Design a protein around this motif. Sequence first.
Motif, PDB file in Angstrom:
ATOM      1  N   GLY A 208       0.792  -1.219   0.000  1.00 23.46           N
ATOM      2  CA  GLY A 208       0.000   0.000   0.000  1.00 23.46           C
ATOM      3  C   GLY A 208       0.825   1.271   0.000  1.00 23.46           C
ATOM      4  O   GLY A 208       0.311   2.342  -0.336  1.00 23.46           O
ATOM      5  N   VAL A 209       2.101   1.169   0.369  1.00 26.88           N
ATOM      6  CA  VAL A 209       3.000   2.317   0.382  1.00 26.88           C
ATOM      7  C   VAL A 209       3.326   2.771  -1.038  1.00 26.88           C
ATOM      8  O   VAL A 209       3.535   3.966  -1.282  1.00 26.88           O
ATOM      9  CB  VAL A 209       4.268   1.937   1.176  1.00 26.88           C
ATOM     10  CG1 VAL A 209       5.254   3.099   1.291  1.00 26.88           C
ATOM     11  CG2 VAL A 209       3.890   1.409   2.552  1.00 26.88           C
ATOM     12  N   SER A 210       3.283   1.838  -1.996  1.00 28.56           N
ATOM     13  CA  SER A 210       3.949   1.992  -3.288  1.00 28.56           C
ATOM     14  C   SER A 210       3.353   3.102  -4.149  1.00 28.56           C
ATOM     15  O   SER A 210       4.092   3.955  -4.654  1.00 28.56           O
ATOM     16  CB  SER A 210       3.897   0.668  -4.047  1.00 28.56           C
ATOM     17  OG  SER A 210       2.559   0.333  -4.370  1.00 28.56           O
ATOM     18  N   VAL A 211       2.030   3.110  -4.337  1.00 30.18           N
ATOM     19  CA  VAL A 211       1.445   4.111  -5.227  1.00 30.18           C
ATOM     20  C   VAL A 211       1.388   5.465  -4.531  1.00 30.18           C
ATOM     21  O   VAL A 211       1.368   6.508  -5.194  1.00 30.18           O
ATOM     22  CB  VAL A 211       0.058   3.651  -5.735  1.00 30.18           C
ATOM     23  CG1 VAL A 211      -1.013   3.757  -4.654  1.00 30.18           C
ATOM     24  CG2 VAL A 211      -0.346   4.402  -7.005  1.00 30.18           C
ATOM     25  N   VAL A 212       1.407   5.472  -3.193  1.00 30.01           N
ATOM     26  CA  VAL A 212       1.461   6.714  -2.428  1.00 30.01           C
ATOM     27  C   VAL A 212       2.794   7.412  -2.661  1.00 30.01           C
ATOM     28  O   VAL A 212       2.864   8.646  -2.731  1.00 30.01           O
ATOM     29  CB  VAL A 212       1.216   6.406  -0.937  1.00 30.01           C
ATOM     30  CG1 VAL A 212       1.300   7.661  -0.082  1.00 30.01           C
ATOM     31  CG2 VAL A 212      -0.129   5.719  -0.758  1.00 30.01           C
ATOM     32  N   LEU A 213       3.860   6.630  -2.834  1.00 30.66           N
ATOM     33  CA  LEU A 213       5.143   7.177  -3.258  1.00 30.66           C
ATOM     34  C   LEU A 213       5.068   7.736  -4.671  1.00 30.66           C
ATOM     35  O   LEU A 213       5.784   8.688  -5.004  1.00 30.66           O
ATOM     36  CB  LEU A 213       6.208   6.091  -3.176  1.00 30.66           C
ATOM     37  CG  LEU A 213       6.421   5.542  -1.769  1.00 30.66           C
ATOM     38  CD1 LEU A 213       7.279   4.302  -1.821  1.00 30.66           C
ATOM     39  CD2 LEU A 213       7.046   6.594  -0.870  1.00 30.66           C
ATOM     40  N   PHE A 214       4.205   7.164  -5.510  1.00 32.64           N
ATOM     41  CA  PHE A 214       4.069   7.630  -6.881  1.00 32.64           C
ATOM     42  C   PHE A 214       3.030   8.744  -6.997  1.00 32.64           C
ATOM     43  O   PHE A 214       2.919   9.376  -8.054  1.00 32.64           O
ATOM     44  CB  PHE A 214       3.729   6.438  -7.780  1.00 32.64           C
ATOM     45  CG  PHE A 214       3.817   6.731  -9.247  1.00 32.64           C
ATOM     46  CD1 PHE A 214       5.046   6.962  -9.843  1.00 32.64           C
ATOM     47  CD2 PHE A 214       2.679   6.746 -10.035  1.00 32.64           C
ATOM     48  CE1 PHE A 214       5.139   7.222 -11.194  1.00 32.64           C
ATOM     49  CE2 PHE A 214       2.764   7.005 -11.390  1.00 32.64           C
ATOM     50  CZ  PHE A 214       3.997   7.242 -11.969  1.00 32.64           C
TER      51      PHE A 214
ATOM     52  N   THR B  93      -4.318  -6.649  -5.352  1.00 32.98           N
ATOM     53  CA  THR B  93      -3.197  -6.443  -6.265  1.00 32.98           C
ATOM     54  C   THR B  93      -3.668  -6.290  -7.704  1.00 32.98           C
ATOM     55  O   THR B  93      -2.908  -5.823  -8.559  1.00 32.98           O
ATOM     56  CB  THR B  93      -2.189  -7.593  -6.160  1.00 32.98           C
ATOM     57  OG1 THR B  93      -1.051  -7.302  -6.981  1.00 32.98           O
ATOM     58  CG2 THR B  93      -2.805  -8.907  -6.602  1.00 32.98           C
ATOM     59  N   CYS B  94      -4.914  -6.669  -7.988  1.00 34.71           N
ATOM     60  CA  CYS B  94      -5.460  -6.445  -9.313  1.00 34.71           C
ATOM     61  C   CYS B  94      -6.043  -5.040  -9.412  1.00 34.71           C
ATOM     62  O   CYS B  94      -6.200  -4.506 -10.515  1.00 34.71           O
ATOM     63  CB  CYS B  94      -6.498  -7.524  -9.619  1.00 34.71           C
ATOM     64  SG  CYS B  94      -6.833  -7.783 -11.359  1.00 34.71           S
ATOM     65  N   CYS B  95      -6.355  -4.420  -8.266  1.00 33.55           N
ATOM     66  CA  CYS B  95      -6.546  -2.972  -8.232  1.00 33.55           C
ATOM     67  C   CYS B  95      -5.231  -2.237  -8.434  1.00 33.55           C
ATOM     68  O   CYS B  95      -5.204  -1.178  -9.072  1.00 33.55           O
ATOM     69  CB  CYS B  95      -7.153  -2.515  -6.900  1.00 33.55           C
ATOM     70  SG  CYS B  95      -8.850  -2.976  -6.530  1.00 33.55           S
TER      71      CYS B  95
ATOM     72  N   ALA C 279      -3.882  -2.423 -12.006  1.00 32.24           N
ATOM     73  CA  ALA C 279      -4.701  -1.569 -12.858  1.00 32.24           C
ATOM     74  C   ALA C 279      -4.364  -0.100 -12.648  1.00 32.24           C
ATOM     75  O   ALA C 279      -4.550   0.720 -13.552  1.00 32.24           O
ATOM     76  CB  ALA C 279      -6.184  -1.820 -12.586  1.00 32.24           C
ATOM     77  N   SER C 280      -3.859   0.249 -11.464  1.00 31.82           N
ATOM     78  CA  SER C 280      -3.631   1.654 -11.142  1.00 31.82           C
ATOM     79  C   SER C 280      -2.290   2.149 -11.672  1.00 31.82           C
ATOM     80  O   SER C 280      -2.151   3.329 -12.012  1.00 31.82           O
ATOM     81  CB  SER C 280      -3.715   1.860  -9.631  1.00 31.82           C
ATOM     82  OG  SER C 280      -3.469   3.212  -9.295  1.00 31.82           O
ATOM     83  N   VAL C 281      -1.289   1.270 -11.738  1.00 27.94           N
ATOM     84  CA  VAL C 281       0.047   1.701 -12.140  1.00 27.94           C
ATOM     85  C   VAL C 281       0.121   1.928 -13.644  1.00 27.94           C
ATOM     86  O   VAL C 281       0.993   2.658 -14.130  1.00 27.94           O
ATOM     87  CB  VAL C 281       1.101   0.680 -11.669  1.00 27.94           C
ATOM     88  CG1 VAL C 281       1.149   0.643 -10.153  1.00 27.94           C
ATOM     89  CG2 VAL C 281       0.792  -0.706 -12.219  1.00 27.94           C
ATOM     90  N   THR C 282      -0.784   1.316 -14.407  1.00 24.75           N
ATOM     91  CA  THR C 282      -0.709   1.430 -15.857  1.00 24.75           C
ATOM     92  C   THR C 282      -1.555   2.586 -16.378  1.00 24.75           C
ATOM     93  O   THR C 282      -1.340   3.059 -17.499  1.00 24.75           O
ATOM     94  CB  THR C 282      -1.123   0.108 -16.509  1.00 24.75           C
ATOM     95  OG1 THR C 282      -1.004   0.215 -17.932  1.00 24.75           O
ATOM     96  CG2 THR C 282      -2.546  -0.262 -16.142  1.00 24.75           C
TER      97      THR C 282
END
Lengths: 139, 390, 111, 164
Positions: A25-31, D149-151, D154-157
């Motif tokens: 959960g930390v990862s996209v918050v960093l992004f 993790t499938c959310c 989907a979010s990183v792309t």
Amino acid sequence: KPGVFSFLDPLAYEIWMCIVFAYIGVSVVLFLVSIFNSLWFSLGAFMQQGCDISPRSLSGRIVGGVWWFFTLIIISSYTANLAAFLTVERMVSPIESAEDLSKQTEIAYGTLDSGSTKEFFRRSKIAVFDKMWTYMRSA
Amino acid sequence: ILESPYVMMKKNHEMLEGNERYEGYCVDLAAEIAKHCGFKYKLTIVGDGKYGARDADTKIWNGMVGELVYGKADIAIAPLTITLVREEVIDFSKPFMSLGISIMIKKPQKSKPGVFSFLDPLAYEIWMCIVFAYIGVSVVLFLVSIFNSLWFSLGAFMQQGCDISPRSLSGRIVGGVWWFFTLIIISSYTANLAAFLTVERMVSPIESAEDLSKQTEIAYGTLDSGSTKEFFRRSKIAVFDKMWTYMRSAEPSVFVRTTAEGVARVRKSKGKYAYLLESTMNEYIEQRKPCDTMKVGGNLDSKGYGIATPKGSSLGTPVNLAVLKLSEQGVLDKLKNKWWYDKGECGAKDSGSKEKTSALSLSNVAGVFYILVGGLGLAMLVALIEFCYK
Amino acid sequence: EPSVFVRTTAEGVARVRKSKGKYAYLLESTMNEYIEQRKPCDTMKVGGNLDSKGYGIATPKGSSLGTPVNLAVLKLSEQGVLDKLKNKWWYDKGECGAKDSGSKEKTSALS
Amino acid sequence: LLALLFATTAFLTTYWCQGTQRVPFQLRRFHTGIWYSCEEGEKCRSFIDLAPASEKGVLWLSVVSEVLYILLLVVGFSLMCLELLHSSDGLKLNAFAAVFTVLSGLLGMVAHMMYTQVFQVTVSLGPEDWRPHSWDYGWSFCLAWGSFTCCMAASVTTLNSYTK
């Protein structure tokens, strides 16, 4: 003494799963400052090894320290539980008297259903063995 | 009267006959009085199950007193409260068993499911004082020339070697001194946390009846009938009369019908219901398995069980010689160790010798998620007002 | 060896105080209550009594005056006059207040 | 989509844990769902919202954290359907599409962690007559984990499309 399963003793198996599921959960918050780079810097902020990329003073500086604040309790707590294991484990001594069995009740003890041994603890006026006689009678 | 552990029927009571069907504290004790006073005896049970209470209208003592006053019984070796109204009708011996109203509560049990369990090794004001010491660092960092370097005081908070370093002036010194100060505290936290996982002593919630006179978080009741209900009513002490005011104003009724109903309501309310009963019985049920109930505090009053003969019988005087003899011999406490500890279902210190707990629970860690997600909401709240700066 | 038995009761109380808690002492509960209320109040009672004893009003044997005394003693106990005078002569007349027993502060962490 | 499918599979969980009171009594096999407690003779009951009284207040907050999880997933579709409305500004709403799907799973993991906090405490009571020698979690709850993790994949792309 076993392998991998003995390594995983002080921290429960689902908590091993939950700490990774909290870590992702930390990862996209960093992004959210702007991902693949900074996830290693969440591993750079995982326990130790002060990281190189720092989102200097915005909200990523805050929560990047909050998760950092969260995880340092746990290696203390992992050490505290492991110390709580090894302290009690070195305190567990084998039975080296009948006075040990006169006090504890975790390990039961019996004799034959007939014999002078059953007669003896009955005849024992010593309060140690008569309590053991009281124990085995009330067993 | 058939009372545990005083007079009980054996498992082979249908197999046995006579007084041999009986068992208990008083059953051993009546044989001792038959040993010292030298008499043949028959253990008989009271018919109505009463200890002996005078009627209000017909003024008839029922029970064992009605078996002694009306000559139906020759002596009463039984648990019997020596009262003044009972003193005038039958002659009691000197009391062999001093007792009184005692406090039965549940044994304490480990349950601290969240944020408060996280804050255990470091005291609450020290959590406040460490932040109030942390804010003093901030302008000292700005004395080199504030908002940037406060994160670098957080960069020097425990770990994660910071990027801005006031290279060799006084900020380099005190920036390491505060850094030197705080690393003692996280080692000391882990030393305190490891000790708290090591010992695990269960702290008792209350001690005194003055504790229950003030607090109301844990309820407490007595039987719906008895001299115990009479006593707090008769208590002119403002402590117990307030507790009497409490239990009278306790809605719904904390007064229960049977003694085991109060013991169950101790167990069923999970320690939110306490209960008051006599000490040796409160000793006894504490020895009866599952042994999740326990006695705390001393007795609220001095009482006494005494051997009762009918008034005018000369047999009670060598009984009074025999009762003081057995007390001085310590036969009473020895049979008390028999019928409460040897015949009890628990060894109270045996389970005290049995506490060897183990691996970490999750509950102390999941309370910290609330401020962790509280930062994640702070991650959103600061970011959205940046769009207002956009 | 040497003798823990002392000559006077205050000698045992002093030897509690002089040995700095390395010397305990055994005496009767209500007096152990009492000296615990007497200043400096550095001594205290722990645990229950080891045996059941009793103070009782004594008349000569054969005197009928003790029987209404026996009526009066049970009356004062049921009235609670005994404990009230016990709160008087131990806690009200004691040199340390009764709520000083609650200021013995507890198992708090990390001074 | 796959993140939404195993989101509802958490809600459609008919077996959360096995329930075993195979006591040598006799053999007992419960299959409790996430709400509805089935068992096996074959019978299925609810057994929802058990004790005590502030864990129930947790269960008030637990259901609220469940409802807010699935509704924020729908917002990720509705803005990306507005992308296909414009594919057949655009970049702001598609960034806003991954806003609520990330804010879905963050509450939803706690929505899964509150119920494991429920299931830890309730088994710690040794539930009223059903305490298992199981506690084998899920099987859809390990699959509801895969919806998280499938959310995330989907979010990183779709923030990668925001950079271009």
